[PDB]
Design a protein around this motif. Structure first.
Motif, PDB file in Angstrom:
ATOM      1  N   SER A   1       0.841  -1.225   0.000  1.00 34.22           N
ATOM      2  CA  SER A   1       0.000   0.000   0.000  1.00 34.22           C
ATOM      3  C   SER A   1       0.865   1.261   0.000  1.00 34.22           C
ATOM      4  CB  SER A   1      -0.906   0.022   1.178  1.00 34.22           C
ATOM      5  OG  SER A   1      -0.152  -0.139   2.362  1.00 34.22           O
TER       6      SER A   1
ATOM      7  N   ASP B   1      -1.241   2.723   4.996  1.00 31.38           N
ATOM      8  CA  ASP B   1      -0.233   3.821   4.998  1.00 31.38           C
ATOM      9  C   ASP B   1       0.722   3.668   6.173  1.00 31.38           C
ATOM     10  OD1 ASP B   1       1.026   5.995   3.904  1.00 31.38           O
ATOM     11  OD2 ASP B   1      -0.470   7.510   4.540  1.00 31.38           O
TER      12      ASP B   1
ATOM     13  N   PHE C   1      -6.902   5.346   6.558  1.00 31.13           N
ATOM     14  CA  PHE C   1      -6.364   5.239   5.183  1.00 31.13           C
ATOM     15  C   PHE C   1      -4.971   5.844   5.083  1.00 31.13           C
ATOM     16  CE2 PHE C   1      -6.278   6.053   0.560  1.00 31.13           C
ATOM     17  CZ  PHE C   1      -6.549   4.762   0.161  1.00 31.13           C
ATOM     18  N   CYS C   2      -4.741   6.940   5.798  1.00 30.02           N
ATOM     19  CA  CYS C   2      -3.579   7.826   5.595  1.00 30.02           C
ATOM     20  C   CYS C   2      -3.127   8.401   6.933  1.00 30.02           C
ATOM     21  CB  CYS C   2      -3.876   8.909   4.556  1.00 30.02           C
ATOM     22  SG  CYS C   2      -5.379   9.884   4.857  1.00 30.02           S
TER      23      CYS C   2
ATOM     24  N   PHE D   1     -11.920   6.638   6.146  1.00 27.85           N
ATOM     25  CA  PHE D   1     -13.193   6.420   5.415  1.00 27.85           C
ATOM     26  C   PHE D   1     -14.374   7.006   6.198  1.00 27.85           C
ATOM     27  CE2 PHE D   1     -13.049   3.564   1.621  1.00 27.85           C
ATOM     28  CZ  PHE D   1     -11.684   3.595   1.458  1.00 27.85           C
TER      29      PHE D   1
ATOM     30  N   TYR E   1     -12.510  11.891  -1.593  1.00 26.93           N
ATOM     31  CA  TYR E   1     -13.385  11.503  -2.709  1.00 26.93           C
ATOM     32  C   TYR E   1     -14.563  12.465  -2.844  1.00 26.93           C
ATOM     33  CZ  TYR E   1     -11.119   7.074  -3.856  1.00 26.93           C
ATOM     34  OH  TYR E   1     -10.252   6.130  -4.350  1.00 26.93           O
TER      35      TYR E   1
ATOM     36  N   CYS F   1      -5.728   5.368  -4.976  1.00 28.37           N
ATOM     37  CA  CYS F   1      -5.089   6.524  -4.305  1.00 28.37           C
ATOM     38  C   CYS F   1      -3.576   6.359  -4.420  1.00 28.37           C
ATOM     39  CB  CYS F   1      -5.605   6.641  -2.880  1.00 28.37           C
ATOM     40  SG  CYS F   1      -7.302   7.250  -2.901  1.00 28.37           S
TER      41      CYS F   1
ATOM     42  N   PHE G   1       0.224   7.582  -4.628  1.00 26.06           N
ATOM     43  CA  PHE G   1       1.101   8.629  -4.058  1.00 26.06           C
ATOM     44  C   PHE G   1       1.826   9.358  -5.193  1.00 26.06           C
ATOM     45  CE2 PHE G   1       1.172   7.797   0.543  1.00 26.06           C
ATOM     46  CZ  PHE G   1       0.665   6.526   0.625  1.00 26.06           C
TER      47      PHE G   1
ATOM     48  N   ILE H   1       1.216   1.695  -6.899  1.00 29.65           N
ATOM     49  CA  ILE H   1       0.343   2.404  -5.934  1.00 29.65           C
ATOM     50  C   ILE H   1       1.176   3.467  -5.222  1.00 29.65           C
ATOM     51  CG2 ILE H   1       0.642   0.707  -4.046  1.00 29.65           C
ATOM     52  CD1 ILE H   1      -2.634   2.562  -4.921  1.00 29.65           C
TER      53      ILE H   1
HETATM   54  O1  LIG Z   1      -5.982   2.988  -3.147  1.00 29.58           O
HETATM   55  C1  LIG Z   1      -6.590   2.178  -2.561  1.00 29.58           C
HETATM   56  N1  LIG Z   1      -5.927   1.010  -2.086  1.00 29.58           N
HETATM   57  C2  LIG Z   1      -4.495   0.836  -2.253  1.00 29.58           C
HETATM   58  C3  LIG Z   1      -3.793   0.827  -0.892  1.00 29.58           C
HETATM   59  C4  LIG Z   1      -3.831   2.214  -0.204  1.00 29.58           C
HETATM   60  C5  LIG Z   1      -2.906   3.252  -0.898  1.00 29.58           C
HETATM   61  C6  LIG Z   1      -2.814   4.627  -0.208  1.00 29.58           C
HETATM   62  N2  LIG Z   1      -2.787   5.821  -0.805  1.00 29.58           N
HETATM   63  C7  LIG Z   1      -2.674   6.781   0.103  1.00 29.58           C
HETATM   64  C8  LIG Z   1      -2.590   8.292  -0.176  1.00 29.58           C
HETATM   65  O2  LIG Z   1      -2.730   9.082   0.992  1.00 29.58           O
HETATM   66  C9  LIG Z   1      -2.663   6.155   1.336  1.00 29.58           C
HETATM   67  N3  LIG Z   1      -2.722   4.844   1.122  1.00 29.58           N
HETATM   68  C10 LIG Z   1      -8.101   2.333  -2.411  1.00 29.58           C
HETATM   69  C11 LIG Z   1      -8.765   3.293  -3.164  1.00 29.58           C
HETATM   70  C12 LIG Z   1     -10.161   3.403  -3.061  1.00 29.58           C
HETATM   71  C13 LIG Z   1     -10.873   2.562  -2.231  1.00 29.58           C
HETATM   72  C14 LIG Z   1     -10.197   1.606  -1.489  1.00 29.58           C
HETATM   73  C15 LIG Z   1      -8.809   1.498  -1.582  1.00 29.58           C
END
Ligand SMILES: O=C(NCCCCc1nc(CO)c[nH]1)c1ccccc1
Length: 304
Positions: free
Chosen positions: A19, A62, A103-104, A119, A161, A231, A233, A275
């Motif tokens: 991730s 993250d 998430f972050c 979320f 989002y 998402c 980086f 990613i």
């Molecule tokens: O990107 C997604 N999953 C990949 C793992 C996470 C990557 C990530 N990017 C950031 C930027 O701050 C933090 N973590 C994802 C997108 C939409 C709905 C569910 C998951």
């Protein structure tokens, strides 16, 4: 001029999608997080596997380093953040409060605070010492994709989002500024420029934009990559040429000239969405990481 990033190391070990990768501020380590619920630590320069850090009950989205390179914070689908002593591999605190996936996350420069995005559509500010939540910002009306402190920690930027980027006064948690265009595609990533004057924002319409924070204006657009779902980086590369670096859903690392917006290099090797990319703090080194068809981290080196 163009960079000439070539593959040096492929780091295997994660059993699911990676991730996030991040270089330690001292340049010594790469930390990786994964859907496999693990954090892995690798030598930045020789790619050598150092250790696995475990304790999360679900996948990690993250990871972020403290300024002294001694601590990690991780953000998990288990609705917690964990603060780690990297030397011992021990969980120092579990940050509890978010009501959905975290998430972050990021440390402030002082590294007395952690910011998290969830979320649950909130941004939280946490005390590193006590592990207590200091503030809950009702920041967005959809999942928070990124959170970042500026260079001195006085500001937070978040993306969602919901299509908004918001800038927050850290001390008060009050919103200073909302960056809107005329449309509002999901904002999948945001961070401050090293000098804190600009914000780099990714949208799920295959577009990166450089924003003047003070004026609230778009200065630059970077296109030609694929970003409609994840998402991904993005980074300011500042060690040699001034580049913009991003992964892509076409399994490539994109590098743009910051000023001209021209693609200067495309790094081929991954077998799934790239990613996460990270730029080394002192060397012309990029770390890249891919989702579950690949699950590897690649280390790349350039002469500029
Ligand atoms: O990107 C997604 N999953 C990949 C793992 C996470 C990557 C990530 N990017 C950031 C930027 O701050 C933090 N973590 C994802 C997108 C939409 C709905 C569910 C998951």
């Amino acid at each position: 001029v163009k960079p000439n990033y070539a593959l040096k190391f492929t780091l295997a070990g994660h059993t699911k999608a990676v991730s996030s990768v991040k270089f330690s501020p001292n340049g010594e380590w790469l930390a990786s997080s994964s859907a496999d619920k693990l954090i892995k630590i690798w030598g930045a320069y020789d790619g050598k596997f150092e250790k696995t850090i475990s304790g999360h009950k679900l996948g990690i989205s993250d990871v972020a380093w403290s300024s002294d390179s001694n601590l990690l914070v991780s953000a998990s689908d288990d609705k917690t953040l964990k603060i780690w002593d990297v030397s011992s591999g021990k969980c120092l605190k579990t940050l509890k409060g978010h009501s959905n996936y975290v998430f972050c996350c990021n440390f402030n420069p002082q590294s007395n605070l952690i910011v998290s995005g969830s979320f649950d559509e909130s941004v939280r500010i946490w005390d590193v010492k006590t592990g207590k939540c200091l503030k809950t910002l009702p920041a967005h009306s959809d999942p928070v994709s990124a959170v970042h402190f500026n260079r001195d920690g006085s500001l937070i930027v978040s993306s969602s989002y919901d299509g908004l980027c918001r800038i927050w006064d850290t001390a008060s948690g009050q919103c200073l500024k909302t960056l809107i265009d005329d449309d509002n595609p999901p904002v999948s990533f945001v961070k401050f420029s090293p000098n804190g004057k600009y914000i780099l924002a990714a949208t799920l319409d295959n577009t990166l934009k450089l924003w003047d924070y003070s004026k609230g204006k778009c200065l630059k657009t970077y296109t030609g990559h694929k970003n409609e779902k994840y998402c991904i980086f993005a980074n300011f590369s500042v060690t040699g040429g001034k580049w913009i670096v991003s992964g892509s859903e076409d399994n490539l690392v994109y590098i743009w000239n910051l000023q001209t917006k021209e693609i200067v290099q495309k790094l081929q090797g991954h077998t799934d969405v790239v990613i996460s990319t990270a730029c080394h703090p002192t060397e012309n080194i990029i770390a890249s990481a891919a989702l579950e068809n690949d699950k590897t981290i690649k280390l790349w080196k350039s002469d500029c």
